[PDB]
Design a protein around this ligand. Structure first.
Ligand SMILES: [Cl-]
Ligand SMILES: [Cl-]
Ligand SMILES: [Cl-]
Ligand SMILES: [Cl-]
Ligand SMILES: [Cl-]
Ligand SMILES: [Cl-]
Ligand SMILES: [Cl-]
Ligand SMILES: [Cl-]
Ligand SMILES: [Cl-]
Ligand SMILES: [Cl-]
Ligand code: NA
Ligand code: NA
Lengths: 229, 229, 229, 229
């Protein structure tokens, strides 16, 4: 089973955790986009009812609108029952790196308050340790970008300002900030790294999502499997 | 000779308009990037003095810093003597389309106040009529994006929301807004279309730059050529 | 009737224009707050149903959420049926000055698309000519504030950067911009000035709302009056 | 002496720490405003030279410009030699609460990197413990405001969204965010609390400034007093 098939199978499995009268955090990225589309189809056909989505990005929000899924802001709802999203890396303890799509801040805001956080990934996302393949995206107040790079470099991270393709200059997040991608060698304690990185003045949020994922749905090459803690 | 060579020769010619003690609007994009490097080099050699650049984007700002050119934002200076910038299209009346790099708002803010606005282009940017080759970028308040696209259908604009590559979702400008690229089949009155677009609630700025460029320096396969009003 | 009762009676009259299944633009400020509250109670009692509000500010959004009115951004809906909002000045031709609350951009975005735009004011808001009592608020990209104040002096506007009370420095709008309050002696041609101001690079919106209001409901000392064009 | 006199003498004492060729972080608020003024005057008299200021807010930047002090952004300089700023509270261990002026994020960004951080206050600012007289300002991503207030209850904090006076709705910071002012009973472990608050998803920065101030200059009714770590 190729990559797109792996993503699709994970998205389909996620639907099994969604019920009528739920407020659902809507993730960002290609794997979760399949889930949003399928959810929209179920709602249109009447197979599920009374669903509201709380989008983690404009991407998720616009896609939900296109698919006629009711949308609400976090401060509009009383609670997020289930949040569904993807990940760039998932380590064996179900700690994640997220942020390749630049939406890590709203993602954490919404997923932190979720009853159940369900992560959708294809096989390639499973790593032996965080930063085996991907850098940690860090959202930063623009004025602080150079100072933060310097400081991370001392910490032995290879850190670079993320640059635009469909704009000149740096990538701007939905919040108007810059993103530094910091490749650390290997993160042995994700939670404490997550906490202490946020203490750096100018750091808005970082891409380590430790001790938050409840269920990881993995589209493996030979089918769907789940990891839980 | 080739594209980058054409860009460089236009950038070198632009130095002819720069004198000691000037405040210079620093444009965005690759053609002007050559000008900024050449300017920084002339400053380092002492061939020019007391120059201050007013960057039209983070890209321009960072580049000027790298080349040790003093900079200031518009509200720090009392005049912009000369502004130098590129363009996506240049018609025979010196009307331009700008905004492919998504920095059109700050570009127009600075260039509008310039004593002389000098445009740098290679041969490919010249068109017989605006929109012969490129769409008009329009920066908009995010929630107005869908209505604006629909409203532009009266001009048969094939308007689309610009999507990110190094972020998921829409491109976000330095000002936190979306960009719609409107592919008009033609614009027979650029000045009044520029006004029309600016009268639409939700539009921050649009990429039609009519009645503003003073000189266009063109790098051609046979050397430098100019256009003037 | 005292002033508060004048506001409330205008709000009560606006409700008569609201029907089931409508999408309603929700204005900003104290007069419209009465309308939002009254609408919420009608919805709560089931006297009206299936309403969606599109807020013109965080103030309106949070108030609507507090009163359990479903909320959506402009790009979430297919149309605005009716928009209700206040005004700082209303001239004999029903042209307005708005923006004292600093939400003029989203207000115009939503109200421009309304099937019917209803304005709510108490007696005090009626004037013989725009700028008889209040300045025109102008929302600007921060960097352009100084140049714009200088440029407005040409028209003999006394223009000042609006300053914060509960923050140091300038007032920041919901869109991250500054507000210049420009006091013209008088505005004999609101629509033309409105357009002229929006064509200045750096101006993203201005408080002249000309040729947009459909109905102005005035709360007076004795009762309610409806003004139409 | 009254408060304005206390502020002025603290400011005058600060000047003594400034040397030629320094890069100085320019604080926000009335006390530091005196310093900036004096610095500008000294520079004009030729009593000091080659000074560059890095402003912590638009207020500080605009004041520096008015006093002809050259300025630069943090990403333009290689170091901050001295940072001068005010405070809302100073405890006996020289931990501070800052942010009444809403500029706490840029303040901490610049002051965190300063060779020496000098705090200027009048008598009223000294406290027995943090939160004796003032709340802790917390800058937050707008959508997270309600969730964060609710979560702050575990600290028995009285937390409120800061509201605008010269705008309707919430105060917006220079970064486009909201401010929650949280009144804790008292803070016994300022650094620990400073860290904890920044771990909350949606919190950009908080007003506790622990283990950062080097010198606190206090204007009192009996003259200047200099506290040091
Ligand atoms: Cl992402
Ligand atoms: Cl840029
Ligand atoms: Cl551009
Ligand atoms: Cl991009
Ligand atoms: Cl997005
Ligand atoms: Cl307003
Ligand atoms: Cl205020
Ligand atoms: Cl400020
Ligand atoms: Cl402050
Ligand atoms: Cl608001
Ligand atoms: Na903005
Ligand atoms: Na922001």
């Amino acid at each position: 089973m190729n990559v797109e098939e792996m993503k699709k199978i994970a998205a389909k499995e996620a639907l099994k955790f969604i019920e009528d009268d739920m407020v659902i955090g809507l993730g960002t990225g290609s794997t979760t986009a399949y889930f949003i589309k399928l959810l929209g189809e179920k709602l249109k056909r009447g197979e599920i009812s009374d669903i509201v989505g709380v989008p983690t990005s404009y991407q998720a929000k616009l896609l939900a609108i296109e698919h006629d899924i009711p949308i609400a802001s976090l401060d509009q709802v009383d609670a997020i029952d289930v949040a569904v999203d993807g990940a760039d890396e998932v380590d064996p303890n179900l700690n994640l790196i997220k942020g390749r799509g630049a939406a890590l801040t709203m993602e954490k805001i919404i997923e932190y308050r979720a009853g159940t956080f369900i992560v959708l990934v294809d096989e390639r996302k499973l790593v032996d340790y965080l930063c085996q393949k991907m850098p940690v995206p860090i959202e930063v107040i623009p004025q602080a970008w150079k100072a933060i790079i310097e400081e991370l470099s001392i910490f032995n991270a290879k850190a670079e300002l993320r640059m635009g393709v469909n704009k000149d200059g740096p990538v701007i997040t939905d919040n108007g900030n810059f993103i530094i991608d910091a490749k650390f060698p290997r993160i042995d304690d994700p939670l404490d790294m997550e906490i202490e990185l946020n203490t750096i003045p100018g750091v808005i949020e970082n891409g380590i999502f430790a001790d938050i994922a409840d269920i990881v749905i993995v589209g493996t090459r030979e089918g769907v499997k789940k990891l839980e803690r």
